[PDB]
Amino acid sequence: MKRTFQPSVLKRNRSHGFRARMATKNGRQVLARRRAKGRARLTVSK
Amino acid sequence: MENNSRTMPHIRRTTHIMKFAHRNSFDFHFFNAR
Amino acid sequence: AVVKCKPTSPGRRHVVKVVNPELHKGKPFAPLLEKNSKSGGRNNNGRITTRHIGGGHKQAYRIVDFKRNKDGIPAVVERLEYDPNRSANIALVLYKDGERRYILAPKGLKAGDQIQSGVDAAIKPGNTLPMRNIPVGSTVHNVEMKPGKGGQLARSAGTYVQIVARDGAYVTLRLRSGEMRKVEADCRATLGEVGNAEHMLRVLGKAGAARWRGVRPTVRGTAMNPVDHPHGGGEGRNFGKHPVTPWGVQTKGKKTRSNKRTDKFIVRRRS
RNA sequence: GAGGACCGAACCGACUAAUGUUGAAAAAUUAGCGGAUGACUUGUGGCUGGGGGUGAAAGGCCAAUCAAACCGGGAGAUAG
RNA sequence: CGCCGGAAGACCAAGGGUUCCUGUCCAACGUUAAUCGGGGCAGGGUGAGUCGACCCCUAAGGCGAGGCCGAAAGGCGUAGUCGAUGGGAAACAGGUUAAUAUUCCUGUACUUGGUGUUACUGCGAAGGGGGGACGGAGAAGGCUAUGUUGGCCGGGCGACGGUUGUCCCGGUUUAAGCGUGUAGGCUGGUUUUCCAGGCAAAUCCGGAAAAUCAAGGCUGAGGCGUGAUGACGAGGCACUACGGUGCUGAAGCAACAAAUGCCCUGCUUCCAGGAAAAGCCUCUAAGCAUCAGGUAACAUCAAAUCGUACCCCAAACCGACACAGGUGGUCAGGUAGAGAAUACCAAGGCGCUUGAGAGAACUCGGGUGAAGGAACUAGGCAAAAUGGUGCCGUAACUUCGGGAGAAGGCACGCUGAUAUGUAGGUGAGGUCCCUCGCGGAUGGAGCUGAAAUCAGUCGAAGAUACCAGCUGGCUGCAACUGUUUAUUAAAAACACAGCACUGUGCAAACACGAAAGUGGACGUAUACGGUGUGACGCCUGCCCGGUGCCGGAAGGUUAAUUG
RNA sequence: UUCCUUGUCGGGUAAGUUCCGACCUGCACGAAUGGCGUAAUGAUGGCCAGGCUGUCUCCACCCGAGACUCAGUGAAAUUG
RNA sequence: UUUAAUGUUUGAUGUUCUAACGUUGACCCGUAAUCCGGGUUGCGGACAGUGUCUGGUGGGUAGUUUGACUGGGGCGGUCUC
RNA sequence: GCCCGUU
RNA sequence: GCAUCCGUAGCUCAGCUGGAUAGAGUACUCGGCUCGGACCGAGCGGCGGAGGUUCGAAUCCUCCCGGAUGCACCA
Numbered sequence A: 001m002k003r004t005f006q007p008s009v010l011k012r013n014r015s016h017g018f019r020a021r022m023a024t025k026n027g028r029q030v031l032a033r034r035r036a037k038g039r040a041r042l043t044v045s046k
Numbered sequence B: 001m002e003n004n005s006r007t008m009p010h011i012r013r014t015t016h017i018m019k020f021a022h023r024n025s026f027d028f029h030f031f032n033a034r
Numbered sequence C: 001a002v003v004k005c006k007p008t009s010p011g012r013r014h015v016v017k018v019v020n021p022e023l024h025k026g027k028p029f030a031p032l033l034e035k036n037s038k039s040g041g042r043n044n045n046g047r048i049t050t051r052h053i054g055g056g057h058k059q060a061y062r063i064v065d066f067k068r069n070k071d072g073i074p075a076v077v078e079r080l081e082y083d084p085n086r087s088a089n090i091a092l093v094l095y096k097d098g099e100r101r102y103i104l105a106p107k108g109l110k111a112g113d114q115i116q117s118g119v120d121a122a123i124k125p126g127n128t129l130p131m132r133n134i135p136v137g138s139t140v141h142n143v144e145m146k147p148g149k150g151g152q153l154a155r156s157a158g159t160y161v162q163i164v165a166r167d168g169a170y171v172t173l174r175l176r177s178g179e180m181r182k183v184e185a186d187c188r189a190t191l192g193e194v195g196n197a198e199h200m201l202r203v204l205g206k207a208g209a210a211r212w213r214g215v216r217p218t219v220r221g222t223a224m225n226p227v228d229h230p231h232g233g234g235e236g237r238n239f240g241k242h243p244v245t246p247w248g249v250q251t252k253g254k255k256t257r258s259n260k261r262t263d264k265f266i267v268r269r270r271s
Numbered sequence D: 001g002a003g004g005a006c007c008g009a010a011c012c013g014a015c016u017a018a019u020g021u022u023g024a025a026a027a028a029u030u031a032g033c034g035g036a037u038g039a040c041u042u043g044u045g046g047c048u049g050g051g052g053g054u055g056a057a058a059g060g061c062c063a064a065u066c067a068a069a070c071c072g073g074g075a076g077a078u079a080g
Numbered sequence E: 001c002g003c004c005g006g007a008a009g010a011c012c013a014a015g016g017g018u019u020c021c022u023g024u025c026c027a028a029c030g031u032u033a034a035u036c037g038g039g040g041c042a043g044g045g046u047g048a049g050u051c052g053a054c055c056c057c058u059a060a061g062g063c064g065a066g067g068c069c070g071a072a073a074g075g076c077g078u079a080g081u082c083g084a085u086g087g088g089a090a091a092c093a094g095g096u097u098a099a100u101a102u103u104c105c106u107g108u109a110c111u112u113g114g115u116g117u118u119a120c121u122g123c124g125a126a127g128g129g130g131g132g133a134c135g136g137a138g139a140a141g142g143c144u145a146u147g148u149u150g151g152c153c154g155g156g157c158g159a160c161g162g163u164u165g166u167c168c169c170g171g172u173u174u175a176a177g178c179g180u181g182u183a184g185g186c187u188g189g190u191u192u193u194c195c196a197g198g199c200a201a202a203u204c205c206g207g208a209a210a211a212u213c214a215a216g217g218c219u220g221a222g223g224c225g226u227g228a229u230g231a232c233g234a235g236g237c238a239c240u241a242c243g244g245u246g247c248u249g250a251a252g253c254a255a256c257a258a259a260u261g262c263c264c265u266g267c268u269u270c271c272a273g274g275a276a277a278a279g280c281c282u283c284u285a286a287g288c289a290u291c292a293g294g295u296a297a298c299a300u301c302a303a304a305u306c307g308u309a310c311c312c313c314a315a316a317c318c319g320a321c322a323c324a325g326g327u328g329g330u331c332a333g334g335u336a337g338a339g340a341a342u343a344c345c346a347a348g349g350c351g352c353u354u355g356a357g358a359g360a361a362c363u364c365g366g367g368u369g370a371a372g373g374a375a376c377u378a379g380g381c382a383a384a385a386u387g388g389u390g391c392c393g394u395a396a397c398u399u400c401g402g403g404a405g406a407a408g409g410c411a412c413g414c415u416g417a418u419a420u421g422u423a424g425g426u427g428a429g430g431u432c433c434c435u436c437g438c439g440g441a442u443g444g445a446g447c448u449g450a451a452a453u454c455a456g457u458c459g460a461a462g463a464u465a466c467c468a469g470c471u472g473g474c475u476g477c478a479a480c481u482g483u484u485u486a487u488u489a490a491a492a493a494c495a496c497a498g499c500a501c502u503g504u505g506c507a508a509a510c511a512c513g514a515a516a517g518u519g520g521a522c523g524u525a526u527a528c529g530g531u532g533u534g535a536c537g538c539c540u541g542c543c544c545g546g547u548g549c550c551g552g553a554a555g556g557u558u559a560a561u562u563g
Numbered sequence F: 001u002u003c004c005u006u007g008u009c010g011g012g013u014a015a016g017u018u019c020c021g022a023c024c025u026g027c028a029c030g031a032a033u034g035g036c037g038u039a040a041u042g043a044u045g046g047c048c049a050g051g052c053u054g055u056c057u058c059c060a061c062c063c064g065a066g067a068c069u070c071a072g073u074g075a076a077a078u079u080g
Numbered sequence G: 001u002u003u004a005a006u007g008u009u010u011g012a013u014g015u016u017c018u019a020a021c022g023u024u025g026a027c028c029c030g031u032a033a034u035c036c037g038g039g040u041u042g043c044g045g046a047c048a049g050u051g052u053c054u055g056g057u058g059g060g061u062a063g064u065u066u067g068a069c070u071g072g073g074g075c076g077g078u079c080u081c
Numbered sequence H: 001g002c003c004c005g006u007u
Numbered sequence I: 001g002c003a004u005c006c007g008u009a010g011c012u013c014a015g016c017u018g019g020a021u022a023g024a025g026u027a028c029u030c031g032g033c034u035c036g037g038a039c040c041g042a043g044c045g046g047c048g049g050a051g052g053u054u055c056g057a058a059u060c061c062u063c064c065c066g067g068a069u070g071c072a073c074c075a
């Protein structure tokens, strides 16, 4: 049957992409936490 | 949720398997000690 | 003309429709139209702030002249049109200089009739003039409350306002609800009643007719759980409570007017 | 040539029975069944955020989780 | 040999990302073996002015200089600026690779800009106006895609009786563009004068007046001509690594039937009254005036960048799997049929990645059954049965619509005749007229073709398969169509049209918001909110002591404050 | 909605705790948290009849897919 | 106890006024702008509205409580002398 | 003001 | 089965004056008005049983009987 993950690249980048994270202060603290942990992928981008 | 299982990483909610009252074949007439 | 449908189906058995053949079968006047998109009852926070709103037919807004301040110039009535935005019908008028405007259509007004606003206009239905030059006892509609602001009272189909007294800089109006109210005498009004007075004689007949107007279904509070409404709960049909709103305020009797700056304009409240 | 009209495929749904129940499947299959121009159905995008939303109201649904989601923290809460 | 064929065929979007093609390998992966593979390794493969993105323009909505508001963080919003699922210039046919093609090649086209020359000329916007520009349902006419038959052309003379014919098989294809302007649709045309309107102006739009003409203009499928002395072409001939390659090539017409596609963003009708902005056309202001600019012809130049392989109802996407699940759009052949149902087929694609035997109980999915026919069981659960078209016929009750397909019954194949194929549909030639052409009248060849009657005939059975209502009687509840516990409950529950009470005079009540503000509503008491009841018919009685709400103000009691 | 209760009487059956009609002794109906009716409608609750049948008396045989044997691959719950 | 007179002075109610304050009335400008601000004017007007303090109401929302004994709990009874 | 009945 | 409240004149109901004294309406009886009602005037008529406290009980105890009300739940 129909499952929960239905992929769409435009809706992916608009919801959790890099400019979406940089637009609010709470999204910028997500990127600071992921840089502090040292992650190889910061956002869900291309 | 069971979020770090190494034996079964594909599944997080598993009590539909072994808990008898959560299986799809559970009937409430099994609970007749009432 | 009030038409009863024949019961060829259970959704048609009770339908009563109002049919006016004098309306304009055709497209509306395009330079007086504007886009009017729907809300769903939601404000700029995105929350529902008025319930039971949603869906319905797409509608274009018609710019209706509520001010009637193009004075001294006469206007002929071209045709009567349908307006989906109000219960009243509207009329397209043509002024002598070539200007076209929508006005509210008053009772007994046909195509070819001659209207004129202004302080020197005549006392006949359709004309707009300040209430200091309307005789006491006349039947008016589209009444201003502030001078120059535009008509705000008695706009709905079949409604009117009686001028009961003029003493001073004020006139006393008998409103449609039965309220006596003081409005100042330099405010404008239009002579006559509003047309389409059998608008209240129609019967929708079925549930889908109310959904065509953008009215969503009402759930009774006594049909809910106590977490949802004060009336909720019960093992069977139980009420036991004093009737309240979804936010706990007593309905069925309790007055909610709280406005201390307009109380000096209200002579008598409705009863 | 009207209709929340009629019969009936696509399409939407889920009333009955059998199978399956370490399944082919964490809810299906087979045979029948209901709606099928409408209060219908569907694609793409958008809005509403947790004592909050949304609800033709079943405590239903809010990412296989809901009489208060999930993640991190107070936190080694407390446990006659 | 079997299966699908409104897909299990073909082409895409979304999503995936090399799974595509060629060579090579078989450890692991593949529910078995594997020489094979969507597996390992290596190499190759995606070619655009016209397709799409980007781009210009906006919807919902987002962000938002100043601004308004908020302990801080921030919230809302103006001017703006983003945002497609919508609007906006232009290409077709044929050929070719192992793998790309409307992109390469061949043939024939089209669009928008820049620059230059010549000829002529009031050009100019952040402004005005037009246009773009829009619903549901229904009906009819004209067409095409496509199909069938005939004619034509090429081939055949049959493994077993017959088959030189009223015989059999195959082919009979051709685009954009350019030219013509038809079926159909809409609308009167032209000139002059004037004006409280279109934020100023206007020769444009709107309004008024007068004269004159009986016609004009706009839109538009298809057809026809050209494109095309070409291309393609059944086959034949010549080589070959037997995969394929090279050359030549006949006919290439007519009739009938016919769409859910086109004319049609039309027409008719209804109420629930049906986006926006730019490109486009036009008007003028500031302004410039032998300038600049505008219009036409000709020449020349430019049209960048990114995507393009492959899968896409699936073994490549979402489901942990090569998982009986889920997934939007486009194309729509034949015979029978009302049909996109169903049965059998075409083009095309497949036999679902363990097999071989045996023929016990029992389980699953089916077939048939003596006599009886619900005796079974909580309960006719499940099965069995009914089933089509035409005609005859049809009760109580009723809100006069219904009930009703009530119930029940009769006919049904094939052959011949009526009639060498009828009624109807289509309509060539010939003739006549003019408006001389895509015209009208007459005319009927040819093609297509029901339904009925009479007579005969075969079978147990003619709606023969697939497909395809069981019917009737009494009663509870809910008026009805709808909605709901995704995964044990579809209902008598919820909703509903209708009814009533109550609040609400507009800066409305009320709701979301420390606020600003927003919804209610660009609505105004025939309106909006809340509550209860629930179509319709007949009705809805008595009680205000209690609790609540509304009204009252005399008296009693009574806060901060004052002292 | 009625505990006593399978109340009593009538109908239907050879036989009816259910059904239909009536009576009133309403444990404990009742008028818009509506009363009583009601044509049409319902995958709604109850009851009866005709047709039909492996539902049953009471099972028998047959066609396929497993079960069984051979070859290859090769699990699970549980367990002092 | 009871009143009037002169001199001096608050509270109440009422009536006008405008100048604080309101304006989701009109017009002009910033300005290519239904925001906002400034200006002119009209209507309200010391009212309304807001801050501090204060009485009432307040399951709208929150934090909690709701005993033990007991031939099982509940119900009943009991709890000290 | 009220003032029933009579096998 | 448990709990709570009631038994008073022929009938329906007061009286707990905290223990020292029983009443009302209606019925019935007698007399009058007119034949009978209605009406008027007078009268008559007794603490559910059985023990106990008490100087003394309808009243307070204990048991019994009768009549009502509520409860008898989770399995």
Ligand SMILES: NCCC[C@H](N)C(=O)O
Binding pocket: A004, B009, B010, B011, B012, B013, D063
């Ligand atoms: N939202 C879906 C997450 C699926 C995950 N593997 C699970 O078993 O929950």
Ligand SMILES: [K+]
Binding pocket: C218, C219, C220
């Ligand atoms: K409702």
Ligand SMILES: [K+]
Binding pocket: C233, C234, C235, C236, C237
């Ligand atoms: K309930």
Ligand SMILES: [K+]
Binding pocket: none
């Ligand atoms: K129809």
Ligand SMILES: [K+]
Binding pocket: none
């Ligand atoms: K939609």
Ligand SMILES: [K+]
Binding pocket: D050, D068
């Ligand atoms: K929460």
Ligand SMILES: [K+]
Binding pocket: D063
């Ligand atoms: K989740």
Ligand SMILES: [K+]
Binding pocket: E026
């Ligand atoms: K191998």
Ligand SMILES: [K+]
Binding pocket: E031
């Ligand atoms: K496998």
Ligand SMILES: [K+]
Binding pocket: E084
């Ligand atoms: K698009």
Ligand SMILES: [K+]
Binding pocket: none
């Ligand atoms: K322009």
Ligand SMILES: [K+]
Binding pocket: none
């Ligand atoms: K326009």
Ligand SMILES: [K+]
Binding pocket: none
């Ligand atoms: K004009």
Ligand SMILES: [K+]
Binding pocket: E100, E308
């Ligand atoms: K390609």
Ligand SMILES: [K+]
Binding pocket: E358, F068
């Ligand atoms: K065997």
Ligand SMILES: [K+]
Binding pocket: E387, E468, E469
């Ligand atoms: K049928």
